[PDB]
Write a protein that binds this ligand. Sequence first.
Ligand SMILES: *[C@@H]1O[C@H](CO)[C@@H](O)[C@H](O)[C@H]1NC(C)=O
Lengths: 49, 45
Amino acid sequence: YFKIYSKHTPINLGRDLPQGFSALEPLVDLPIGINITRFQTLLALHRSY
Amino acid sequence: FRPTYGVGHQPYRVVVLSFELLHAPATVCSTNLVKNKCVNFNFNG
Ligand SMILES: *[C@@H]1O[C@H](CO)[C@@H](O)[C@H](O)[C@H]1NC(C)=O
């Protein structure tokens, strides 16, 4: 089960990963068994700076 | 595919069904409701 636990948080902060509790709720579950032994992020920023 | 052909030459459709017993299964598988009284529930298993 590839479970994706997602939670967006638009909170005020001067630096990333600030103080405060925000539980990660489950969003999408995938009932497909695949061997994920490696990982990369598809980052098609295009408009990047 | 002629109508005059016999059973040996007549089209016999073949559609394969193969249920796979792999690791991740599918949901290939409901009463009504009561309001207030003692019953047995199988709500979602
Ligand atoms: C890949 O993942 C599936 C699901 O967890 C598992 O059944 C299978 O054995 C894995 N394959 C191998 C041999 O790594």
